[PDB]
Amino acid sequence: PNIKIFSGSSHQDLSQKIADRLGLELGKVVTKKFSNQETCVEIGESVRGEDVYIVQSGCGEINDNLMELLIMINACKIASASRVTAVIPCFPYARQDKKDKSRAPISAKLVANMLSVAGADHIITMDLHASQIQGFFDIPVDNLYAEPAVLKWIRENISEWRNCTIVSPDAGGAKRVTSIADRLNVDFALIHKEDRMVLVGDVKDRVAILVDDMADTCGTICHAADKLLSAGATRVYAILTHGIFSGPAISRINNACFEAVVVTNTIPQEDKMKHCSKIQVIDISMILAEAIRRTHNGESVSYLFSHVP
Amino acid sequence: PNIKIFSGSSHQDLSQKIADRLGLELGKVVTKKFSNQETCVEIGESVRGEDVYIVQSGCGEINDNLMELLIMINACKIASASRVTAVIPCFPYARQDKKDKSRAPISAKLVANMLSVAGADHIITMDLHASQIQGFFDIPVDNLYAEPAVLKWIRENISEWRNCTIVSPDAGGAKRVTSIADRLNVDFALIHKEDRMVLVGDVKDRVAILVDDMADTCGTICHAADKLLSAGATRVYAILTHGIFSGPAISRINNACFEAVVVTNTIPQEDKMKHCSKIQVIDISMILAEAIRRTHNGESVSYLFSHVP
Amino acid sequence: PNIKIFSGSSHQDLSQKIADRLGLELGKVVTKKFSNQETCVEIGESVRGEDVYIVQSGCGEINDNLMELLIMINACKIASASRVTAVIPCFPYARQDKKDKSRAPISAKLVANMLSVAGADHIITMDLHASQIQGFFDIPVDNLYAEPAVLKWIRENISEWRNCTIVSPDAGGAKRVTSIADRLNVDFALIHKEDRMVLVGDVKDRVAILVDDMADTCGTICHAADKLLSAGATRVYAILTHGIFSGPAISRINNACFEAVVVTNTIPQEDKMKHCSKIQVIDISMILAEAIRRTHNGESVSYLFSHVP
Amino acid sequence: PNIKIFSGSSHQDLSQKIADRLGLELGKVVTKKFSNQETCVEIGESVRGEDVYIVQSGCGEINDNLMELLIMINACKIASASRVTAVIPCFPYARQDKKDKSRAPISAKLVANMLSVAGADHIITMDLHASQIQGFFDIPVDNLYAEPAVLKWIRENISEWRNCTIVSPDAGGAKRVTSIADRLNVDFALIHKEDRMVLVGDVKDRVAILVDDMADTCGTICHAADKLLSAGATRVYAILTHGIFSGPAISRINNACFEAVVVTNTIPQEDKMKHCSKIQVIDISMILAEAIRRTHNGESVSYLFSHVP
Amino acid sequence: PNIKIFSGSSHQDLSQKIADRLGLELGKVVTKKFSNQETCVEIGESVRGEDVYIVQSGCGEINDNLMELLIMINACKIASASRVTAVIPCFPYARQDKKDKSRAPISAKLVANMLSVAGADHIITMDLHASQIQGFFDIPVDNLYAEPAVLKWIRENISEWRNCTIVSPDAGGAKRVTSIADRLNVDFALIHKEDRMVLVGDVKDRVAILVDDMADTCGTICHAADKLLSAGATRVYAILTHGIFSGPAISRINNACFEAVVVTNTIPQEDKMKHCSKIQVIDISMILAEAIRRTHNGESVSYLFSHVP
């Protein structure tokens, strides 16, 4: 079986970058809409006996992109692909991972069930909002981390990184920032709201680096940055793997004191970058390409958790 | 267990009509979108031990509405509803019911699988594009027919119906028109394309009635009507259960010779009716309400196949 | 169908308390071991058509108790019980809810799969370590909260509760303490380790109340209490729903400065209470009995999230 | 894919013997207990794309060992092993293979379901108590026989084997003894209880050889041996594949007239052999190693039913 | 059949509290007066096949409220309710339960007859003046007791309750006070008039607690309290289930030495509480709600005689 990479319509540039890193052309697929807006999918080449990877991020018109992904998986499965892998850099509905007191769906579990029944044998994703989502599946799920690329960016872009501070915006994700601070051998200052915020960790005259899994409306990072600037930090950075930037996010970032808002390209960023000068993108296509290549070859994927390829 | 009717966002007016016919209020549900356009669903009342019916048609923004339906089903299922029934008047992706020579998905089967894995115990739908779709499910599927309401409309609106002709637009659905002609005791003239059309059945100086399951772009019925008017039919009617009317449909209908284009309200029609004077709507809410009531009470549903309630 | 309550061997006293609150006798069941230590289960009365609840906590000899629960569920299912519900006050393997970087099982998901394949139609549990565990199931899961009973205990046992502080021991569970502080209208001081601990929130001359989901080795609460006593708190309390108290826990509690270590009786506590004078137990049998009664009667279970019955 | 052999904690020596016969080292795995006695499993090497065999017998602390096996299977499955095979020399709960008049579990079926849902693609076992247990699975099950090794032992250890008699202790397993007697070309004397026993087949002045699948409490073989010695047999042997020897078994064997009690090493025997001089062990590690090697290479496994490798 | 709760005009707040505890909305009913002051009742929703509970206490304008209750029962009965239950917390005309030497009506029996002929299938009431009134009916009557709530109030509000004394004001109801004293394990001092009063039971330097079924004009409790204060009781409390407080009652209570006059809310008390600072109310809505719920579900009501829900 050979690797076949197919792109959904959500993130074409990322799929092309992945395909170039693998020395492959993107598989021929027609992904459009019928007149009544139903998804139309046509696999333009035989996938019989091949190892198929479908790249689609949970961004943009999320329900359309998710339907397209499921329809593509189904088409490849009934076309006798030997294995079908969904490469989902940003997992849709990941924030609906529990009920907790409300008569609400667990939408992430529903998405996992739909991916399974569509025929996915394997999932590759990056920085799941909650790693318990891996347990929503019965098929293997490789949850990659942007952390090696983030560490590389910090070392090559922040001159005072040895004295900086790594700040979690909410108490929930402070595990990520502790791992990053341990890797950099720095202090991890913490922030949480009580309309007021409380911060532990000396930030005065230092650089503070907010790290989080995603920025949707940027309410979380803007409040944290306001707090940090209250406590005398010389500069504040925000680093996120998923740059969703919906709603009022671009205006809030423009009016905030961030030196830089760095995101990975798990979601296309060109349109947002046009309207916001302080957004910078870390390419993670090498990590995804290496994960695809290693799953195909039976090589260790977890080696990527700590190594930039 | 009591009947609880919940409406999705696709067809609120139909759900309200159904609820009024059952003497019930619509269940409290919040169905909206998060900032990043992910579906947000919140069941506003306990459904524990209840017989839940969720009304959502495959129309409008089809992928959003389908996701909303699946999320609502999941929310009701994990909220310990005794039974969950999807009331889907127009089944989405019904026209993708086979591959036939192409490397294509069977999207209708995927939709059936998704509805099943979401937790639906029962499906109620109207005039499935292909009744083989019933076999795509392992749960019971009640496929209702608009034919009794169509016959009622014909008898009360076409003065010359005893001399009229019932015409199938494509060879595929001529079964429907034969059933209708047998019920009315009239001739069924047939039409199919060879850019030219061929018609069997005397239509001269008579009324011809085109009957079909749906009109999407109205290419099918406009070509058939052109043929019929070539052969001297005094008036031509089109009657359809599903009035999708996407793309150039309204302009084609406006420029065509139809005396009337009658559709059921399985899909909301007010916006289309604003731009097209010859569209008339048959209310089928009584049929759906009776089907819901009979499934709840253990009464015969097939009795509705031949009786207007 | 009538309610039948069966007790596993793990927590007989809790099952008896539940049965008394429901006005029922415990169902006749023989639960012992064969000579080779395989679990032997014999249902001593017909359960045909009945609503069966099996009470077994994930405590003591956890693997034996889990096997016993699964075997009992299987016996009741193939004996034609109308419905089988596992009442698992402390869910076993709940702390193995993710992999996160290691080549490890997701044991909680395996347990959920085993409960499902054994035939459980419904799960009732209390204060799941991670509420995402609800998504590990496809059957409904009612995750009850000890919080109403905890609030009652605080109001009836701590004279200065209006001035007290609610302290989370680890950053992970601070959601619980924020909910409790909001209910009591008090400040929530927070603690996390950097062998040193950092605390936010005035605790001087006040009572601090540590709240957490469980105390296993009591390393978490003893370190937090040491920190709190460093910052001048007059008294320190610990309140937990699950009192596992394994390993060196009793000695650490005896040598710590806790005014009281309060636990619910989701796990039997008499043996631990013999060796530790500062352990007090909150009975939660009324909450479990009400949940059983409400699921049986189709009444709202979520009403218990905020109301002491 | 390469063979990877992992040992559970139940029978380490057997797993090592199997690994040596295959020219392999045992895979790195940490199998221990958390403080609260929950099983902790950590796969110490990548198994991605490998053919994994996990060796665990249903002996000792049976519920702990079964849980450990299931957790290991789950860990290997979600670590993207190409295939996972449970090598279970003595199948746990095999004697609970039916209900028969009692409101009892079919525990063997539950165990099969649990192994399947954990992710096992294949089962290798030896001398199932009832071969109908193979039908409890939907995955392939290779049920190996100790009979070739038993025949070899008889020919090399009993000088009068050409004149001996092969005796079934209970009527249920006389099929095994008929096969053995046919292979040796000897008479098969039979025994069954009516507190008295009845025997057919001349045993006077001869050697009698009791053959059975397992000896748990040794009540079965001791009663049969008492009967045989009543009828003048010069010596009595017992041969069993599974030497469970629980409860009073060692004392009964010590006080019985057996010349030898021979068991295979499907269960570790060193501790029992310390307290009982007449227990001898047949190594079956070559049979298990050959079965593993042949399943891996696509070679005939049934060839082992009649051939000692 | 579902529970439907309807409120009469007498005690709306109590009915609302009951409905909230049951998770229900009050049934739609118009209860007003025509111009000529005849009661007008209009049931605003179908009660066909439902289990109807009508809440109306014998207080305020007693004859109007009784007529309203009877008219509501009649309306629900001829509207084909499956069952109609009168929830009458304070039974009107209960003190006219006998003739005894006078040419007088037995008005309580007349009220029972009227309730029966109106169509009531069941009566729920609290602390009937004479429990023989239960025999005035041929339908079942559940006579609830305020005693559990009274005991709870005593334990949570009187610091010296272990040394207190429970005093009956008249010889007639001393049964209630003996039951209460037995529950509290205290002495029951007794009082009766000879314009002078005689008291048995040491009350000196102690708290005395008068307990009675009702306080109408408060002549009974004020005389008893005067006696108790003559004999040196440090404080005197009065506790009553029915706080009628008609005529000069408020002035007598204001001029009496009561530390507190505690009543249940079987009768609305806000207006009386405005004019009398020492009146406190025990909510008994949980007891009534539990009785309604248990009668509906076929659960034991007598369990409430000794248990606070």
Ligand SMILES: Nc1ncnc2c1ncn2[C@@H]1O[C@H](COP(=O)(O)OP(=O)(O)OP(=O)(O)O)[C@@H](O)[C@H]1O
């Ligand atoms: N796409 C979405 N956009 C915004 N909010 C969402 C979205 N999906 C779910 N939510 C809601 O957001 C909330 C989850 O918030 P969040 O993940 O930030 O915190 P948490 O899960 O409570 O805690 P933490 O992640 O810190 O452990 C829920 O109320 C959920 O319903």
Ligand SMILES: Nc1ncnc2c1ncn2[C@@H]1O[C@H](COP(=O)(O)OP(=O)(O)OP(=O)(O)O)[C@@H](O)[C@H]1O
């Ligand atoms: N939503 C859609 N809008 C338009 N075309 C669609 C849609 N879904 C599927 N199709 C395509 O339409 C075609 C199916 O057409 P149609 O159902 O009219 O005819 P058929 O199935 O070939 O025959 P018949 O229904 O007469 O037996 C397929 O090529 C299918 O891919």
Ligand SMILES: Nc1ncnc2c1ncn2[C@@H]1O[C@H](COP(=O)(O)OP(=O)(O)OP(=O)(O)O)[C@@H](O)[C@H]1O
């Ligand atoms: N029974 C157990 N006893 C002790 N440790 C366990 C047990 N089961 C799992 N663990 C281990 O404990 C760790 C989980 O710890 P814990 O739940 O306290 O923190 P977390 O999940 O990392 O974060 P948090 O709960 O604060 O969000 C994992 O390494 C897991 O393997």
Ligand SMILES: Nc1ncnc2c1ncn2[C@@H]1O[C@H](COP(=O)(O)OP(=O)(O)OP(=O)(O)O)[C@@H](O)[C@H]1O
């Ligand atoms: N681990 C165990 N130890 C002892 N007895 C067990 C064990 N598991 C099950 N049993 C019980 O042992 C009995 C089964 O006995 P056994 O297998 O010897 O005979 P059988 O199945 O009735 O007949 P046969 O095997 O001769 O055809 C059942 O009553 C079963 O419940």
Ligand SMILES: Nc1ncnc2c1ncn2[C@@H]1O[C@H](COP(=O)(O)OP(=O)(O)OP(=O)(O)O)[C@@H](O)[C@H]1O
């Ligand atoms: N609503 C009322 N208000 C006042 N007095 C009433 C009322 N209804 C009846 N009565 C009268 O009150 C008397 C009953 O008094 P009460 O119940 O206190 O004592 P009893 O029945 O004689 O004895 P006991 O209740 O101590 O065994 C009768 O004379 C009766 O006519």
Ligand SMILES: O=P(O)(O)OC[C@H]1O[C@H](O)[C@H](O)[C@@H]1O
């Ligand atoms: O609230 P938003 O800023 O839109 O979303 C970003 C944050 O909200 C969620 O918890 C994410 O994990 C981030 O921490």
Ligand SMILES: O=P(O)(O)OC[C@H]1O[C@H](O)[C@H](O)[C@@H]1O
């Ligand atoms: O082609 P369109 O007019 O858009 O769609 C309407 C017809 O096309 C499909 O076969 C339907 O069943 C109808 O017969």
Ligand SMILES: O=P(O)(O)OC[C@H]1O[C@H](O)[C@H](O)[C@@H]1O
């Ligand atoms: O570490 P232990 O004290 O044994 O276990 C108790 C804590 O560890 C886990 O995170 C629990 O949720 C508690 O917060």
Ligand SMILES: O=P(O)(O)OC[C@H]1O[C@H](O)[C@H](O)[C@@H]1O
């Ligand atoms: O009764 P035990 O001696 O403990 O167990 C050994 C026998 O019991 C079972 O039938 C086995 O198959 C053996 O025949």
Ligand SMILES: O=P(O)(O)OC[C@H]1O[C@H](O)[C@H](O)[C@@H]1O
């Ligand atoms: O005389 P009132 O104080 O008005 O009425 C209260 C008492 O009178 C009746 O016997 C009641 O049962 C009470 O004991």
Ligand SMILES: [Mg+2]
């Ligand atoms: Mg979250």
Ligand SMILES: [Mg+2]
């Ligand atoms: Mg967050």
Ligand SMILES: [Mg+2]
């Ligand atoms: Mg078709």
Ligand SMILES: [Mg+2]
């Ligand atoms: Mg057609």
Ligand SMILES: [Mg+2]
């Ligand atoms: Mg955890």
Ligand SMILES: [Mg+2]
């Ligand atoms: Mg914790």
